[PDB]
Design a protein around this ligand. Sequence first.
Ligand SMILES: Cc1cc2c(cc1C)N(C[C@H](O)[C@H](O)[C@H](O)COP(=O)(O)O)c1[nH]c(=O)[nH]c(=O)c1N2
Ligand SMILES: Cc1cc2c(cc1C)N(C[C@H](O)[C@H](O)[C@H](O)COP(=O)(O)O)c1[nH]c(=O)[nH]c(=O)c1N2
Ligand SMILES: Cc1cc2c(cc1C)N(C[C@H](O)[C@H](O)[C@H](O)COP(=O)(O)O)c1[nH]c(=O)[nH]c(=O)c1N2
Ligand SMILES: Cc1cc2c(cc1C)N(C[C@H](O)[C@H](O)[C@H](O)COP(=O)(O)O)c1[nH]c(=O)[nH]c(=O)c1N2
Ligand code: DMA
Ligand code: DMA
Ligand code: DMA
Ligand code: DMA
Ligand SMILES: [Mg+2]
Ligand SMILES: [Mg+2]
Ligand SMILES: [Mg+2]
Ligand SMILES: [Mg+2]
Lengths: 364, 364, 364, 364
Amino acid sequence: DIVNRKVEHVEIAAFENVDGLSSSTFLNDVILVHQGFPGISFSEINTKTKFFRKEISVPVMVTGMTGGRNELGRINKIIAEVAEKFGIPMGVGSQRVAIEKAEARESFAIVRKVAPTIPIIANLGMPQLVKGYGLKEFQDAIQMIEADAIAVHLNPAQEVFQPEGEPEYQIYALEKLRDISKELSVPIIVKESGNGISMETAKLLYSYGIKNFDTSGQGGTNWIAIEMIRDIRRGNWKAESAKNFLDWGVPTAASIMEVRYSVPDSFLVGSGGIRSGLDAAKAIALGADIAGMALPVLKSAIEGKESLEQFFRKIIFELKAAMMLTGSKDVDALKKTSIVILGKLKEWAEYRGINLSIYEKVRK
Amino acid sequence: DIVNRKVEHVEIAAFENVDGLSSSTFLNDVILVHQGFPGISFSEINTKTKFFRKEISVPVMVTGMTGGRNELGRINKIIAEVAEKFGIPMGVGSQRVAIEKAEARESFAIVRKVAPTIPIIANLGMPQLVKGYGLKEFQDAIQMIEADAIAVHLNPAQEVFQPEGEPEYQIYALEKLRDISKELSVPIIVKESGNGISMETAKLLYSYGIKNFDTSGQGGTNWIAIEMIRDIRRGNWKAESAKNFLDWGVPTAASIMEVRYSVPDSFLVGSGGIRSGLDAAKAIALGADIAGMALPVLKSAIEGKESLEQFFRKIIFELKAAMMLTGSKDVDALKKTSIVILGKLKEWAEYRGINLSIYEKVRK
Amino acid sequence: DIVNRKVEHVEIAAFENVDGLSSSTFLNDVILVHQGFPGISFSEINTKTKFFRKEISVPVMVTGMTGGRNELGRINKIIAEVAEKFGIPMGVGSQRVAIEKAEARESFAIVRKVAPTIPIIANLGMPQLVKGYGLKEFQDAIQMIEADAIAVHLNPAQEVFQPEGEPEYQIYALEKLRDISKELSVPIIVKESGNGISMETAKLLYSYGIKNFDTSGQGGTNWIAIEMIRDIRRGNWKAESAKNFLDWGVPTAASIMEVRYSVPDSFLVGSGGIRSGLDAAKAIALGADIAGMALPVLKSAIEGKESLEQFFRKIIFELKAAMMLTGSKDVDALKKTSIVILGKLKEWAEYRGINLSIYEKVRK
Amino acid sequence: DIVNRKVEHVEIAAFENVDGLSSSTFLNDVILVHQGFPGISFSEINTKTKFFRKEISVPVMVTGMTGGRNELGRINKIIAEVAEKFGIPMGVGSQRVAIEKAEARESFAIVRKVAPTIPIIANLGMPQLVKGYGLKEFQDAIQMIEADAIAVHLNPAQEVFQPEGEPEYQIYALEKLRDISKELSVPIIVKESGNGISMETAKLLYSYGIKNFDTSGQGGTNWIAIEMIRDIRRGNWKAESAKNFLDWGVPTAASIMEVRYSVPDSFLVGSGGIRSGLDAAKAIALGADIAGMALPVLKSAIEGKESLEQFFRKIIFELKAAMMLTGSKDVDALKKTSIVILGKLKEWAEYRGINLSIYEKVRK
Ligand SMILES: Cc1cc2c(cc1C)N(C[C@H](O)[C@H](O)[C@H](O)COP(=O)(O)O)c1[nH]c(=O)[nH]c(=O)c1N2
Ligand SMILES: Cc1cc2c(cc1C)N(C[C@H](O)[C@H](O)[C@H](O)COP(=O)(O)O)c1[nH]c(=O)[nH]c(=O)c1N2
Ligand SMILES: Cc1cc2c(cc1C)N(C[C@H](O)[C@H](O)[C@H](O)COP(=O)(O)O)c1[nH]c(=O)[nH]c(=O)c1N2
Ligand SMILES: Cc1cc2c(cc1C)N(C[C@H](O)[C@H](O)[C@H](O)COP(=O)(O)O)c1[nH]c(=O)[nH]c(=O)c1N2
Ligand code: DMA
Ligand code: DMA
Ligand code: DMA
Ligand code: DMA
Ligand SMILES: [Mg+2]
Ligand SMILES: [Mg+2]
Ligand SMILES: [Mg+2]
Ligand SMILES: [Mg+2]
C-alpha cells in the first residue's frame, strides 16, 4: 500500500508534467564567465573528486529515488550498474518500505551486488525519527546495501499535501539524529526533496552536528505538484491548496548560496533541477562540492541501460565543456572560476544578508 | 434607490471581471522562506489570536460588504453563520442605507442573531461625517448589530468615478471622528476600499487618534473598475477616465509595509486581494496583525452555506501549511518568520524611505 | 511643396501608426501616491496657474502643430476657439511657410481672431537661424498672431531622416538666438519635437540665456517614424535607417527630470506622449510647470469642435481626479505631492548622476 | 575536407538561423543620450580615424571570414574591392588552409590585388600555435596578402562542439605568440569568434604583450549554433550538448566594457552582432576604438557588389546620424559622448567589479 505510493511516485514523476512546474532554480541568474583563452587542453581536464573516503570519476551523484518492489528494483539495477561503469555515486530511495516488509529488501540489495565499488548512499525520512526509528533501523538500512553514508530526507512540504502524509518535525528528532551519529560507522547527509535548504535550517542542523547537506531546491521535480496529482486522483480537496503552493521553496541556486554561506566548511551537494552538465557546472561553481540529479536519471533508466549511458555521456561532456571554456583544469578550479550573479538571485542574496564580497571569498 | 447601487455593487463584483483588473497586490514580490526542518508538528500549530477584547480562531476577518435589502441580508446571514462556526470576525457593509430607510435595518441585524459570539464590525463612510453624521448615527450603527468595533471607510477614488459619488474629504471630518471616538463604547477601524493606505494618510489619521487600520490595497476588488462598469452602463462619459485610473493606488503589500512602518504600534488588517491562506500568511508575515477578505467570501456565500464552509476550510488549511513550512507554531512566530522582498515592492520601499533594516526590526 | 510636407505631416500623424511607435515615455515608471484621506473636497480644487504674464485655467497647453494652407487653418481655428473657451494656451505650427509665402499668413492669423485672450505662442525652427532668419522674421511671426511668446523648435533627429531635411545646428545659431532675445518683446521657449531635451542640451541653452523649455520627449508622436513613412513613400533608402532609430531619444519623464535638475529655476513644459489628465498630472508632479499635448488635440479637432471640447473636458476631469486623490488643492500642491520612481526611469536617473534626494528637494 | 568545412561555414552562416540565436549583445542596455541641440552641422561630421599606421575613412572594419577555394575567393574579391572604395579595413578568414594546400593561396591573394591601399589583416587560429605553427607560417600569412597586421583567433567554444575540433589552448601557445611578436613586421590582434573576451583573458593576453583586442562577443553570429548544425547534419551526438550552450559567452557590450576597463590603453575592436551604424556607434561610445562586422557583410557580398555598396552606405549614414544626434563632430567626440547603462549590462558590470565612475573616466 505504501508500495503503491512508491509506484505512483515513479509513475507520476516519469510521465506527468511535474519537472519545474511553476518553479524555478534561479540558475538562469548564474553565468559562468567565458574564457576565450582557457590555458588548458580539453583532454587534460580532470573531473575526479572525493566523496567521503572514496574517489569518484565525476563531481555528480544520482540522488535517491526508489525501491520497494520488483519493477522498482530493476530500475535500481539499471541505475546502479551504469553508475558503477561511470564511477559516480548513487543514493537509493527511502528504505522505510524495506524495514516494514522484508520482501522489499531485494529491490535495494541488488544495488550493491551490481555496483561493488562506487559510494552507495542509504535513505530514511526524518519523520520516521519521531515515529520510533533509531540506531538499529539506521544500521539496517546502511548494511542492507553496504552504504558508504546515509541520507536523511526533509520533506515537510510533501508530507503536508500528501493524502496520507505525516508532517511531524518535532525538534526532538534532531536530538535523536545527533545521538544516532554517535555510533554510526558512516556519515549522515541531510537532503531536502524539491523545496530547498535555507540558512536557518542549515545552521540548526549544523548546531546538531550535521556537516553534509544536499540542497534539493525548487525548480526541479516538484513534489508539491506530485502530491497535488495524487490528491486530484482521489478527489481529495487538498489538491487546490497544493496548487497555491506550487512555487513554494528555496530555488536551488539560492539554496546553494545559503548553505555555503551559513556553513562555510560544509560538504554540499547542489541538487534540484540539474538537467545538463552546464547546470551541474553552475551549481559547483556557485558553491556546491558536487551536483546531484534524480528525475532525468529515472527517465533514462526507464528507457533502458544504453539510454542511461548515453545520458551520462552527455552530462559528462557538457560538464567538461563548461570547465574547458572557463579554464578549469580540475574540479577545484571550477569551484573558484569567475561568475556573474544577476536578477532575482541577486535580490534574494541581498535581502538575505549574503554579502557578495564575503561570499566570493567563501566559495574559494 | 441607493439600495439599487447596493445590488449593482454585489452583482458586478460577483459576476463581472473586476478582481485584480489591471492592478497588482505586489504579493508576488513577497516570499516566505521555506524551512526544510520546521521544528514543529502540523497538529500543534495554534492559529488563535486577539481581536480587541475577544479571541478569534484564525487571524483572518471577513471585511464589510453589503446589506440594505432582503437578498442582501440573506447573504449576510450565510456569511455570519459560517463566520460564527469558524470563530472568525465579520464586518458588515455600509450601514448608511439602514440609517436612511428603517426597512433596511433587518438585513444588518440578522448578523448578530445568527452570530452571537464572534466580533462583528459596523460600517459607515467617511463622506457621511462631512454630510452631518455624528455620535448618534455611529451609536445607531454600532448597537444595531451589537458591534465590537466600527469601520469607517475611505473611498475617495470610488466616489470620484461613481456616477452619483460624493468626493468630499475635508479635514474637518477628522476633527469630528476624533470627537466621536471620545464617547464611543467600541474602537474605530479606518479602512480603505481597494486603493490602499499610504504612510501620509496613516500618519495623519494617527495624529487624530486612530490606531487601527485596514490596508485594503489595490490588486483585489477594483472599485474604480466597478464604477467604470456602472458608468458604461448609463453611457456616463466618466467611464473612459476611470479606465485610465484602473491601476491607481497603493498595492496591498506596499500598504502593509507603509502603515506598519509609519505607525509601528498600530493594529493592522492586511486586506485587498487576499485569495488564499498563502496570501494571508504573506500579509501577516509582512507586517499585518490579521488578514482581511471580501470578494472571495461573497462569491462563495452566493453559492451557498456549504460552499463557504469549504472555502474557509481551504483558507485555514493553506494558512497552516504556510505556518508549518516556515516553522511558525503560532501567529506571533509567523509575524517574525523569515521573508525575502524582491522586485517592484523592494523599489517601492526604497524610494519611499523605508529602511529595510529598521523595517525588519519593526515587524518583530 | 513645403505646404505639401505640411499636409503630409498632419495626414500621417492623424491617420497612421506613429504614436509611441517603438518608443516609451517612461511615465509608467512614475507613480503618484494615492491618499485615502485627501483632506479636500473635489469642488474646491483650483487648477489655475501662471503662463508668463497671463493666467490660464488649467496647467495644460496645446503645443504647436500646423498651419500654412486652408484646411490646415480651419484646424487651427477649431483648436484655438476651443482653447479660448477653456482658457488654455496654444502654440501654432512652424511659421516658416508664412514668412516664405504670404498666402499662408491667414492660416495662422485666424488663431488670434478667434482666441483673443489666451496666450498664443509663435513657432520657428532652429535650422532657420543658421539659414539667415533674424530679429525681423521673429518679430513677423510674433506680431502675425499677437504672440505672447515664441517657441523655437529643435528637430535634428527629424531633419536627419527627412528626405529634404536641413540638419544644421551650428553653435553660432545660439549666439544669434541670444541676440534676438535682446530685443524681442516676448519670451522665447525652446522645445524639442519628440526626441527630448537632455541635461547637456538644457545647460547649453541656459548658458545662452534660455530659461523656458519644453521637453517634447520620446513616447509620443514619433517624428523619426513619420519621416520613415515619407521615405518609404518615395522609395528613399533612408527609410530602413530610420527604422533603426525608432526608439532614439530621451523619454519624456527622463527629460522632465533632466531639465528640472540641471536648470532648477526653469519654466518647464512637460510634453511628448501626454494622453490623459493622469499623464499630465504625473508630468507636473515629476517636475514640469505645465503639461503639453499635440497629437491627441489634432485627432479631436479633425473630428470637429464638440469632439475637441469633449476631449478637453475628459483631460481636465482626469487631472482633477489625480489632484483630488493626492490631496492636491491647487497646482503648487501637485508639484510637491508624493511620488514613487521605479524601473528604467530610476536606472536612467541613477546613471545620469541625478541624486534622488537632491531631486526631491528641487521639485519643491 | 577542411575546404569543405570552409564552404559549410559560409553556407550555414549565410542561409541558416544562426544570427543572435538564443544570444544577446546587451547593446539594448546601452543608450546614447540624444542632444536636441547638436552644435554641429551634418556635413561637417568627420568619420576618419587611425588604424595602426594607416588612416581609414570610417571607424568600422570587416572582420575575417573566409577563403580557401574559388567561390570563397570571389566573395573575398567583392568584399575587398568594395572595402577599398569606402576606405575601410578588411580581415581575411583563417589562412590555415592556404598554408596546408597551395591551390588555396589565390583566394586570399586576390584581396591585395583588388584593394591596394586599405589595411588588410591576416588570420590564423590560436590552436595552430600549439600544433607547430611559428614565425614562418605567420610571415607567410602576412606577406601572402601584404597584411598590415595579423589576427590570431580564439575559438575554444567552437572547437569543443566542432565534430572535428581541436580544443587545445595550453599556456605555452602564448609564450610562442609573444616570441613571434618579437620579429613580426606588423602588429598582432587577438580576436574571439562569437563568445567574447573577458577581463581575465584580456589581462592574461596583455601580460604576454598583446595590446590589440577584438571583442567578438555573443549576440551576433553564433558559432556554437553553427557547429550544432554541422553536428545535427552528421547525427553526431554533440548536437544536443551544443544546444545547452547556445547562450554561452560574454555579450559584446559587456566584453567592450571588460577589455577597456581591464586594459585601458588597448586598441579595441568592438564586434559580435554589430548590425547597424547605431550598433557601431554604441560600441565605439561604450569604449571600442572601432566597430567590427562579419555576417551582414557576407550576406550582402553574396548578393553582389552593389548590394554591398548599398549596405556600407546605410551603415555609414546610420553612424553619422548617431554622431549628429549626440553632437559628435568626429570619432573622438563620439568616444566620450553621454551614455546611459541599464538593465542586465549594469548588473553584469557591478558584479564584475567595474566601478561605473572610474569606467566613465577610462572611456575618455
Ligand atoms: C520518483 C522519485 C522518488 C523520490 C525522489 C525523486 C524521484 C523523482 N527523491 C527526491 C530526489 O532525490 C531529489 O532531491 C529531487 O527530486 C530533486 O532532484 P531532481 O529535480 O529530481 O533532479 C527522493 N528523495 C529522498 O531523499 N527519498 C526518496 O525516497 C525520494 N523519492
Ligand atoms: C460587494 C462588495 C461591496 C463592498 C465591498 C466589497 C465588495 C466586494 N467593500 C470593500 C471590502 O471591504 C474590501 O476592502 C475590498 O473589496 C478589498 O478586499 P477584497 O479584495 O474584496 O478581498 C466595502 N467596504 C466598506 O468599507 N464598505 C462597504 O460597504 C463595502 N462594500
Ligand atoms: C501634425 C503635427 C505637426 C507638428 C507637431 C506635431 C504634430 C502632431 N509638432 C510637435 C509637437 O509640438 C510635440 O512637441 C510633439 O508632437 C510631442 O507631443 P505629442 O506627443 O504630439 O503630444 C511641432 N513642433 C513644432 O515645434 N513645430 C511644428 O511645426 C510642429 N509640427
Ligand atoms: C562565414 C564566417 C566565417 C568566419 C567568421 C565569421 C563568418 C560569418 N569569423 C568570425 C567573425 O570574424 C566575427 O568575430 C564573428 O562572426 C562575430 O561577428 P558578426 O556577429 O559576424 O558580425 C571568423 N573569425 C576568425 O578569426 N577566423 C575565421 O576564419 C572566421 N570565420
Ligand atoms: C521525495 C521523497 C522524500 C519521497 C519519499 O517520501 P515518502 O514519505 O513517500 O517515503 P517514506 O514515507 O518511505 O519516507
Ligand atoms: C467599497 C465600498 C465602500 C463600497 C460602498 O460604497 P457606497 O458609496 O455605495 O457606500 P455608501 O452607502 O456609504 O455611500
Ligand atoms: C515636429 C516639427 C518640428 C515639425 C515641423 O518640421 P518641418 O521641418 O516640416 O517644419 P519647418 O520646415 O517649418 O521647420
Ligand atoms: C569563426 C572561426 C574562427 C571560424 C574558423 O574556424 P576553423 O576551426 O575552421 O579555423 P581553422 O581553419 O584555423 O581551423
Ligand atoms: Mg517520509
Ligand atoms: Mg458612498
Ligand atoms: Mg524644419
Ligand atoms: Mg580551428
